[PDB]
Design an enzyme around this catalytic site. Structure first.
Site, PDB file in Angstrom:
ATOM      1  N   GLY A 113     -87.425 -61.951  29.803  1.00  0.00           N
ATOM      2  CA  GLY A 113     -86.635 -62.675  29.899  1.00  0.00           C
ATOM      3  C   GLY A 113     -87.541 -63.813  30.418  1.00  0.00           C
ATOM      4  O   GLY A 113     -86.386 -65.141  31.026  1.00  0.00           O
ATOM      5  N   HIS A 138     -90.041 -70.802  20.600  1.00  0.00           N
ATOM      6  CA  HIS A 138     -90.297 -69.742  20.479  1.00  0.00           C
ATOM      7  C   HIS A 138     -88.407 -68.732  21.131  1.00  0.00           C
ATOM      8  O   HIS A 138     -88.543 -68.072  20.028  1.00  0.00           O
ATOM      9  CB  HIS A 138     -91.097 -68.377  21.133  1.00  0.00           C
ATOM     10  N   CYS A 157     -89.440 -66.870  30.183  1.00  0.00           N
ATOM     11  CA  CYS A 157     -90.064 -67.559  29.166  1.00  0.00           C
ATOM     12  C   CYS A 157     -88.944 -68.967  29.645  1.00  0.00           C
ATOM     13  O   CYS A 157     -87.544 -68.637  30.134  1.00  0.00           O
ATOM     14  CB  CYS A 157     -89.658 -67.082  27.943  1.00  0.00           C
TER      15      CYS A 157
END
Ligand SMILES: O=c1[nH]cc(-c2cc(-c3cc(Cl)cc(OCc4ccccc4)c3)c(=O)n(-c3cccnc3)c2)c(=O)[nH]1
Ligand SMILES: O=c1[nH]cc(-c2cc(-c3cc(Cl)cc(OCc4ccccc4)c3)c(=O)n(-c3cccnc3)c2)c(=O)[nH]1
Lengths: 305, 305
Positions: free
Chosen positions: A143, A41, A145
């Site tokens: 942030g 993503h 991820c």
């Protein structure tokens, strides 16, 4: 003596963390050999994540649209591909700090260390468990991820987890390093149930053995039980069923302490039925299920890396 | 969201750990620039530690009697000296992995990360607090001496602790990196009291603010208190007195949550007087005092290194 929620030393993983940018989205990537792994993503906008067609979104992306930064080092991207829910970015430079490593998919109930990262930079390390419902109760902010979970055996890092999502309940979901989600989740901002969680019975028993080894003995009683009777109680208190396989994994702790597994089950049964009566075990006022039997033997015997 | 007992990433310290051998004694050392730091009782035998004269024991030692090993690397020892309770071994090679660093002496109540090591090799990392009585409740086995505690600010490692001893009570004592013990302890195997420990009130309040930030709000009540009245209650439950300095350090959490420090004190007072009534806060069934206000702001705002 003493017993702590201990994480693996994180240096070998710190050297693999990079920043990945695509458009206006920035998150964390994992740089091993000449491949960078990150959640797919990274290619979404805020609006895309409500209902993304990742195939279509990726088609609009070229190699030069992915910026990969490792400290000062700007990495040149020479290939990109999607594998399940992770992006794989081929770069023209092998990470000189690549440790010995493999990719593993862990089982529910197993523990691992998380290196929480922001903008490619490590901020902290902690130990957690894969819940029986395949979520993790982490500490992650926006942030984070692409932060990864791992175990270490002497010199080999086993990567088991990449962080993708925080659910509306505040718990966390992610994938193995082949991009396959743990549990039923999909990388889309839409309603998703995690389903009933249970307590990891074999880990609780392992921790009770750790308590005995360290001198916390008040909970040992005069009773025993059978596996069938114990599992009746386990079901009533939403504990995972204990199997003979679990009994066998507990064998070395049973041998070291001289406490038969089924006697320890009887002690656990009495704690579940009667509570802790205002007492503590290893500094905790509830029954702790984030230590595996291997963890307890490791910490109580000082194996190193 | 989520809240975890998080440690600093340990890579910068992993690169400094070496093994130090003198006679038949082996423990951990810290290799910074061209100096190796380790506990001076590396020069003792089992019998020496009951009543050692370190001055006399060291006089029988020469440079070539200290073996320092950093992985494969055998380090050549060209000087030795004793500073308080630590030995300083001058080697002829500067550690190429020396991070930016300083030596700091922390205050009681402050937290730090411990990299537990055996035979020079890191085995785990965890976060703990310097108790008000200057012990730490660590997880250490024989061979762990010379493991170090630290904090990190962006790129600078502040070393604050070197592990020396386990007391008969199972708690741990050690020095700053100038060799000065925290607390009243001496490096000798003889009876030593640690004296009464208290709970770190300002940290407990910081953690209650962390709970509020994360959605655990059930403990907020309709009451307030005064600093004087609260400190009466604190004394009764062996909590450290709260000072105006502490109130000010809690200022940013108060501003972020809109909960006045003295209102939070009133909530804490009611938890102390009435208990937790079978509930949990941030997954804990007791009041947690191992997070400083700085820790809570760091973890809840994602500052990195
Ligand atoms: O640039 C960047 N953009 C985005 C992120 C990012 C993106 C997500 C995310 C991604 C997808 Cl695909 C779906 C999704 O759904 C949530 C949901 C599921 C079900 C129902 C409602 C909502 C969320 C996220 O959870 N987090 C985060 C935030 C805090 C802690 N841990 C992770 C960060 C990032 O880190 N960097
Ligand atoms: O080679 C090596 N030799 C020795 C050690 C070593 C040595 C000590 C030690 C050192 C001194 Cl000078 C005095 C002392 O007194 C204890 C005491 C104090 C008061 C009353 C009774 C007893 C103990 C120790 O505590 N530990 C350890 C063990 C487990 C966990 N953490 C640390 C290890 C080593 O690590 N390596």
């Amino acid at each position: 003596s003493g017993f702590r929620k201990m994480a693996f030393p994180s240096g070998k993983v710190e050297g693999c963390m990079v920043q990945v940018t695509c458009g206006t989205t920035t998150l964390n990537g994992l740089w091993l050999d000449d491949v960078v792994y990150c959640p797919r993503h990274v290619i979404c906008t805020s609006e895309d994540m409500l209902n993304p067609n990742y195939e279509d979104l990726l088609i609009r992306k070229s190699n030069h649209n992915f910026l990969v930064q490792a400290g000062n080092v700007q990495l040149r991207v020479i290939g990109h591909s999607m594998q399940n829910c992770v992006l794989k970015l081929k770069v023209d430079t092998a990470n000189p700090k690549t440790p010995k490593y493999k990719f593993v998919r862990i089982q529910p109930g197993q523990t691992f260390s998380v290196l929480a990262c922001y903008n490619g930079s490590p901020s902290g390390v902690y130990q957690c468990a894969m819940r029986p419902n395949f979520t993790i109760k982490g500490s992650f902010l926006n942030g984070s991820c692409g932060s990864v979970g791992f175990n270490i055996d002497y010199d080999c890092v086993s990567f088991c987890y990449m962080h993708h999502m925080e659910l509306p309940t505040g718990v966390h979901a992610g994938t193995d390093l082949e991009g396959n989600f743990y549990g039923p989740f999909v990388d889309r901002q839409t309603a998703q149930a995690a389903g009933t969680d249970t307590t990891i019975t074999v880990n609780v028993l392992a921790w009770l053995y750790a308590a005995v080894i360290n001198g916390d003995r008040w909970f040992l009683n005069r009773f025993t039980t059978t596996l069938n009777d114990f599992n009746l109680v386990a079901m009533k208190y939403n504990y995972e069923p204990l199997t003979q396989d679990h009994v066998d994994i507990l064998g070395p702790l049973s041998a070291q302490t001289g406490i038969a597994v089924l006697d320890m089950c009887a002690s656990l049964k009495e704690l579940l039925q009667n509570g802790m009566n205002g007492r503590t075990i290893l500094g905790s006022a509830l029954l702790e299920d984030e230590f595996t039997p291997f963890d307890v033997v490791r910490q109580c015997s000082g194996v190193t890396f």
